Design an enzyme around this catalytic site. Structure first.
Site, short mmCIF file in Angstrom:
data_model
loop_
_atom_site.label_atom_id
_atom_site.label_comp_id
_atom_site.label_asym_id
_atom_site.label_seq_id
_atom_site.Cartn_x
_atom_site.Cartn_y
_atom_site.Cartn_z
N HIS A 461 0.84 -1.19 0.00
CA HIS A 461 0.00 0.00 0.00
C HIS A 461 0.88 1.24 0.00
CE1 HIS A 461 -3.65 2.36 1.09
NE2 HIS A 461 -2.73 3.17 1.59
N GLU A 462 1.70 1.36 1.04
CA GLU A 462 2.60 2.49 1.20
C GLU A 462 3.58 2.63 0.04
OE1 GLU A 462 0.86 2.74 4.21
OE2 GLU A 462 1.08 4.73 3.35
N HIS A 465 2.23 4.58 -2.72
CA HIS A 465 2.34 6.03 -2.58
C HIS A 465 3.76 6.45 -2.95
CE1 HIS A 465 -1.55 6.78 -0.92
NE2 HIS A 465 -1.35 6.08 0.18
N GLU A 490 -5.79 7.72 -2.75
CA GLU A 490 -5.72 6.32 -2.38
C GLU A 490 -5.96 5.37 -3.55
OE1 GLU A 490 -4.43 5.42 0.50
OE2 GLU A 490 -4.39 7.54 1.08
N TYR A 600 -12.19 6.87 0.60
CA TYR A 600 -11.50 5.59 0.55
C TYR A 600 -12.26 4.56 -0.29
CZ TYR A 600 -7.80 2.49 2.02
OH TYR A 600 -6.68 1.67 2.01
ZN ZN Z 1 -2.80 5.34 1.63
#
Ligand code: ZN
Ligand code: ZN
Length: 665
Positions: A461-462, A465, A490, A600
């Site tokens: 996930h991170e 980014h 997101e 989200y």
């Molecule tokens: Zn995130």
């Protein structure tokens, strides 16, 4: 400095002392104000692209970069004094940021520039810069009479005090409960062992998450779950209800003075959702499409409760109370797909996950990751990587990996943008820099650091980014990196989580830490098949919160508690406990991004559309699709609207077919 080396492109200092942080802060503010003072006094008829737009853009770059050496240490420095100085720096700098955005004199100059300027002779991104800047000014009321602006101020200053208080209350709360071991039945010994004991044969249980959830998820004693849920959802009730009662009406007034019907319209305007009506329809239609799945799960949970109540003679009330949801949803996971997480983790040595994660991304995005040998860092545990484009050798940027819990370090998972990938004054490009900050279990006993599946999912996930931050290349700093619409940020991260539910990808990310044997095909199938366990109620619960969020910003004269109760029974099927006030414990409301909670779920729909319609269609490791994703979704950063980039990538408007198909609807 060239775009084909990292040499000299990253000179951020991570060893600044408290006094150096204070000095640099004072110097940054003063020096930066002088630039705005210079632009704010240009004669309106003499305003030009170079003495105005270019000046504001150049200063935004230099300012944002100096500011990160000052506001980042508060999150990762091991020195308590340095951390406090950084926090103080961030406070002065944040007040300064507000001050500059309220510069009527500067606003005037940009408004006149856009007129006298022939928008067709400048790059599309610069037109966007002007339009967005002017738009932010109107959103700040810089076009309104002095009287009205002052009113908006006295209200925003009071809304900040209210949000800081709402949060302070919840944080400083130390409510506790005392239970006998008998009352904490089914809870692990490791959990009980970590609890403080009283002068009686009782254990202290606080309301903080680390205590609350394992008790709501595993405690087999119904009344214990009940008391915890009651106390947990009544925290700061009076104080925060009182705050909400003042805060929401204030948000309405401010929106009116700004020209918007509601605070929701104000917030949603800058999102890809655009409006209150669009969000309401998004959420309303989703809960309808999800209704049947929620009826089945709710039914299944009911058969589990009634049954268990007979095997222990607790008594049955024929319903799923709030303090029963987590419990039975956990029982569900243990019956549908018995996935032993403490066993699975053994297959995920952090070393193997890290190498795998990076290998996957290098191949997918046409990139090369190379660790920096003797890198300047804020902690010996941090590693630095240089990112090059496989084809051209171009150094897009660098990223740091801070993976272990440490005293004073940010305790949640996140990706920090430290340096934007925008143009410098001479046309050379600034190297993007990002820091991945997570807290994964450290090595205990003789075993290496072993990650549970949800942690491998957080890592991905991170890192999603991080890639957005690093691959993003724009002309202006304000559109660089992850500076996209809040309900769009997101998208990159959630789309990449799909890879941790992909059998073939999982093989690349796992190897038993001891003998090194792979995960059995049987377990892999089970793991990916369990992705959607309880999705019905889980998603419905997210929709409930999303509705409450919109509601509290569409109204004012509304009772937060009743509104929450309303949606709980109507959409979730699990009544909100009479006497509780969840919304008054809803940290999302006060500080943060109020009116955007739906973001989200909104992003998941999009990521799901891209993943299924494109990566699944062409093969999820197909380099062609990988490059299009990077070029069309990541590279432009926030220099283009979210929907436009989605369209560019999909070649059609996005839709929710994929999101619904996956869910099984
Ligand atoms: Zn995130
Ligand atoms: Zn007035």
């Amino acid at each position: 400095m060239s775009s084909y080396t990292a040499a000299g492109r990253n000179v951020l200092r991570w060893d600044l002392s408290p006094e150096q942080i204070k000095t640099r802060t004072e110097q940054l503010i003063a020096q930066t104000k002088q630039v705005y003072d210079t632009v704010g006094t240009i004669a309106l008829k003499e305003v030009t692209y170079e003495n105005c737009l270019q000046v504001l853009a150049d200063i935004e770059v230099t300012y944002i970069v100096e500011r990160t050496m000052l506001d980042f240490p508060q999150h990762v420095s091991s020195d308590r004094e340095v951390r406090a100085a950084s926090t103080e720096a961030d406070k002065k700098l944040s007040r300064f940021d507000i001050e500059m955005s309220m510069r009527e004199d500067v606003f005037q100059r940009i408004v006149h520039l856009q007129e006298t300027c022939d928008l067709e002779k400048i790059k599309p991104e610069a037109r966007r810069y002007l339009e967005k800047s002017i738009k932010m000014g109107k959103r700040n009321g810089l076009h309104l009479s002095e009287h009205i602006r002052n009113e908006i101020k006295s209200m925003k200053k009071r809304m900040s005090e209210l949000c800081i208080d709402f949060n302070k209350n919840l944080n400083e709360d130390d409510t506790s409960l005392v239970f006998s071991k008998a009352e904490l039945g089914a809870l692990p010994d490791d959990f009980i062992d970590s609890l403080e004991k009283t002068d009686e044969d009782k254990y202290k249980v606080t309301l903080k998450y680390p205590h609350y959830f394992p008790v709501m998820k595993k405690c087999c004693v119904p009344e214990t779950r009940r008391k915890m849920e009651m106390a947990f959802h009544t925290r700061c009730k009076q104080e925060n209800t009182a705050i909400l009662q003042q805060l929401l009406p204030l948000r309405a007034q401010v929106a009116k003075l700004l020209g918007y019907n509601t605070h929701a319209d104000f917030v949603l305007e800058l999102n890809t959702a655009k409006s209150t009506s669009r969000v309401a329809a998004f959420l309303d239609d989703l809960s309808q499409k999800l209704k049947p799945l929620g009826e089945a799960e709710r039914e299944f949970i009911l058969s589990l409760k009634k049954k268990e109540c007979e095997e222990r003679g607790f008594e049955y009330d024929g319903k799923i109370n709030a303090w029963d949801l987590h419990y039975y949803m956990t029982q569900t996971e243990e019956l549908k797909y018995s996935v032993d997480q403490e066993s699975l983790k053994e297959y995920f040595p952090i070393e193997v996950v890290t190498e795998g994660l990076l290998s996957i991304y290098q191949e997918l995005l046409g990139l090369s990751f190379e660790q920096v040998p003797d890198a300047h860092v804020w902690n010996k545990s941090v590693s630095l990587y240089t990112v090059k484009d496989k084809a051209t050798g171009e150094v897009l940027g660098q990223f740091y990996l801070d993976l272990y819990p440490r005293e004073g370090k940010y305790n949640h998972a996140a990706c920090f943008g430290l340096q934007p990938g925008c143009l410098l004054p001479d046309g050379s490009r600034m190297m993007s820099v990002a820091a991945l900050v997570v807290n994964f279990s450290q090595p205990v006993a003789g075993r290496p650091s072993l990650l549970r599946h949800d942690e491998v999912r957080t890592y991905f996930h991170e890192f999603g980014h991080v890639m957005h931050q690093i691959c993003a290349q724009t002309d202006f700093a304000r559109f660089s990196g992850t500076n996209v619409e809040t309900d769009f940020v997101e998208v990159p991260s959630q789309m990449l989580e799909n890879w941790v539910w992909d059998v073939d990808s999982l093989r690349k990310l796992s190897k038993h830490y001891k003998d090194g044997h792979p995960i059995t095909d049987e377990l892999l199938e089970k793991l990916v098949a369990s992705r959607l366990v309880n999705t019905g109620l889980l998603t419905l619960r997210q929709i409930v919160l999303s509705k409450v969020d919109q509601s509290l910003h569409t109204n004012a004269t509304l009772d937060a508690a009743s509104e929450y109760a309303k949606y709980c029974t109507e959409i979730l099927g699990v009544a909100a406990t009479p006497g509780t006030n969840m919304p008054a414990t809803f940290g999302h409301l006060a500080g943060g991004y109020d009116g955007q909670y739906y973001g989200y779920l909104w992003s998941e729909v999009f990521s799901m559309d891209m993943f299924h319609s494109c990566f699944k269609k062409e093969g999820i490791m197909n380099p062609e699709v990988g490059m299009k994703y990077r070029n069309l979704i990541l590279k432009p950063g926030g220099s283009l609207d979210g929907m436009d980039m989605l369209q560019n990538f999909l070649q059609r408007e996005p839709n929710q077919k994929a999101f619904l198909m996956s869910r099984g609807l």
